[PDB]
Amino acid sequence: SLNEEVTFFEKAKRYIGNKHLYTEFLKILNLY
Amino acid sequence: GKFLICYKCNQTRLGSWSHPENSRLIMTCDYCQTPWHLDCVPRASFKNLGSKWKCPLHSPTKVYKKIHNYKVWKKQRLINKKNQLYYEPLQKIGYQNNGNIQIIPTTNSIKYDFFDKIYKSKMVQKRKLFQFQESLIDKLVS
Amino acid sequence: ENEDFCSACNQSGSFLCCDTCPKSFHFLCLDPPIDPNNLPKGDWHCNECKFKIFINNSMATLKKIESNFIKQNNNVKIFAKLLFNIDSHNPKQFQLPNYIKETFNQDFKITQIDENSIKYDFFDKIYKSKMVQKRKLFQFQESLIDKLVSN
Amino acid sequence: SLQIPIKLKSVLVDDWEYVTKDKKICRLPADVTVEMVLNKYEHEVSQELESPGSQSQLSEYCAGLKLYFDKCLGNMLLYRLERLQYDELLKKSSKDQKPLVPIRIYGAIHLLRLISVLPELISSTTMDLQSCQLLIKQTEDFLVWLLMHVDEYFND
Ligand SMILES: [Zn+2]
Numbered sequence: 001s002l003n004e005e006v007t008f009f010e011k012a013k014r015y016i017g018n019k020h021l022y023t024e025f026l027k028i029l030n031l032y
Numbered sequence: 033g034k035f036l037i038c039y040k041c042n043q044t045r046l047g048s049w050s051h052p053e054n055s056r057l058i059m060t061c062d063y064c065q066t067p068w069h070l071d072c073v074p075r076a077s078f079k080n081l082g083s084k085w086k087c088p089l090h091s092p093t094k095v096y097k098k099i100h101n102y103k104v105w106k107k108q109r110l111i112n113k114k115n116q117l118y119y120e121p122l123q124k125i126g127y128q129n130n131g132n133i134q135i136i137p138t139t140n141s142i143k144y145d146f147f148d149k150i151y152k153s154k155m156v157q158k159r160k161l162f163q164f165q166e167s168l169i170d171k172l173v174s
Numbered sequence: 175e176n177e178d179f180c181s182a183c184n185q186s187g188s189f190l191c192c193d194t195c196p197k198s199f200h201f202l203c204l205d206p207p208i209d210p211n212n213l214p215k216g217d218w219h220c221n222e223c224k225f226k227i228f229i230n231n232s233m234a235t236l237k238k239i240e241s242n243f244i245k246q247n248n249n250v251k252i253f254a255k256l257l258f259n260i261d262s263h264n265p266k267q268f269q270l271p272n273y274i275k276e277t278f279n280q281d282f283k284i285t286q287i288d289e290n291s292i293k294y295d296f297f298d299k300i301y302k303s304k305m306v307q308k309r310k311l312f313q314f315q316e317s318l319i320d321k322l323v324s325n
Numbered sequence: 326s327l328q329i330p331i332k333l334k335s336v337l338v339d340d341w342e343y344v345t346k347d348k349k350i351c352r353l354p355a356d357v358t359v360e361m362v363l364n365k366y367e368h369e370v371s372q373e374l375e376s377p378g379s380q381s382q383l384s385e386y387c388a389g390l391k392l393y394f395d396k397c398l399g400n401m402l403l404y405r406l407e408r409l410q411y412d413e414l415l416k417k418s419s420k421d422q423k424p425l426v427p428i429r430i431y432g433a434i435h436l437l438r439l440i441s442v443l444p445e446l447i448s449s450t451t452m453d454l455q456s457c458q459l460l461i462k463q464t465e466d467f468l469v470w471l472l473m474h475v476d477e478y479f480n481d
């Protein structure tokens with residue numbers, strides 16, 4: 001439970017691939 | 033020379049010229065060049081003229097939110113380097129930026145700092161859960 | 175070249191005349207308690223004088239090493255600006271604050287944010303939203319229980 | 326923008342009377358160090374604080390306050406008949422080869438002195454609006470947490 005919570009962000013970054021799409025993803029998460 | 037892999041389906045349906053109906057149309061975004069199939073994002077046109085096509089992965093420059101009237105937010109326009117100031121916050125957590133931000137690169141201790149910070153907080157939450165349900169069952173006896 | 179009164183402790187005594195600034199200090203009114211009759215041999219640059227010749231009185235290199243200093247200590251980040259002024263501070267006697275004695279290019283500034291701060295903010299705000307809706311649901315349930323009990 | 330209550334003012338002015346009109350200074354190890362205060366203060370507020378983000382600001386403010394205490398005690402947080410005490414402390418620290426450290430030495434009352442000088446000290450240089458508000462908010466809830474048990478650290 002805890003491990004997935006702390007590991008969610010960089011595994012999402014790994015799934016995103018390109019760093020520009022991850023930059024826009026972090027922009028989305030900031031705008032929220 | 034590589035194959036444009038569509039983002040959603042993680043495939044490139046090139047076809048075979050003996051079954052050209054097996055080929056799925058693919059376009060690239062006009063901003064980040066991310067290739068998308070015409071079916072993964074629902075589109076029938078290729079966006080040849082008019083405005084530049086934007087893939088779904090880009091953050092919006094204009095959004096509407098419900099007040100529960102409404103409120104609108106528009107991203108600031110780009111400014112030339114002689115009149116544009118990029119500033120770095122001193123406050124890391126909870127800094128109310130206008131939604132107009134820039135991402136800087138992140139430079140082992142921080143990784144474990146995040147791990148304990150979730151532990152403690154979730155623990156406190158459990159405690160907050162456990163402090164109020166006891167008052168609920170102690171209200172029913174009265 | 176000298177001052178009649180100590181600019182740190184605000185009484186007259188044995189002084190050390192600085193080269194550029196006319197302010198002088200006692201043998202203890204310094205970050206370090208300079209041992210009298212044992213003062214290092216030299217020009218006697220003070221903290222202000224060492225701050226000016228460290229930066230060579232130019233703004234660009236001083237802002238760049240200030241940003242480098244803040245980059246080093248992100249654990250004390252909100253105080254990191256306040257750690258810098260200290261270097262350019264000539265230690266002085268603790269004078270009481272006044273209230274203690276009693277009884278446009280800046281509008282479109284782009285925020286430079288990092289990934290970890292976005293992660294912390296997203297987690298903070300989702301936890302806030304989830305538990306305020308959970309606690310308001312609990313409060314409405316308790317209020318409805320009290321209403322049904324009273325009726 | 327600090328509006329501290331009358332009890333902190335009274336204990337600060339009585340410390341002023343003991344340090345100016347009297348030769349008496351604080352004890353050597355200064356008893357309970359700010360170590361203790363900040364440490365427990367975290368151990369109570371973080372178990373009262375709810376978000377992981379807010380606990381990050383709590384630990385961040387604790388570490389910054391400790392390092393600022395260490396790096397600013399020799400700069401402003403000293404009075405008469407304490408410069409000699411600090412000189413004795415730094416000559417004693419070099420004897421046992423351990424480096425000097427103000428946090429685990431001075432008493433929690435010099436920490437309150439640092440909080441007292443903080444409003445005038447912050448506004449001297451260029452500082453934000455929101456960062457300033459965060460700093461005075463952490464200031465105010467640290468002060469009211471002190472106001473819960475002033476008698477633990479401020480009893481003669
Ligand atoms: Zn596809």
Ligand SMILES: [Zn+2]
Binds near residue numbers: 064065089
């Ligand atoms: Zn795109």
Ligand SMILES: [Zn+2]
Binds near residue numbers: 181187199200
């Ligand atoms: Zn002096």
Ligand SMILES: [Zn+2]
Binds near residue numbers: 193194221222
């Ligand atoms: Zn000088």
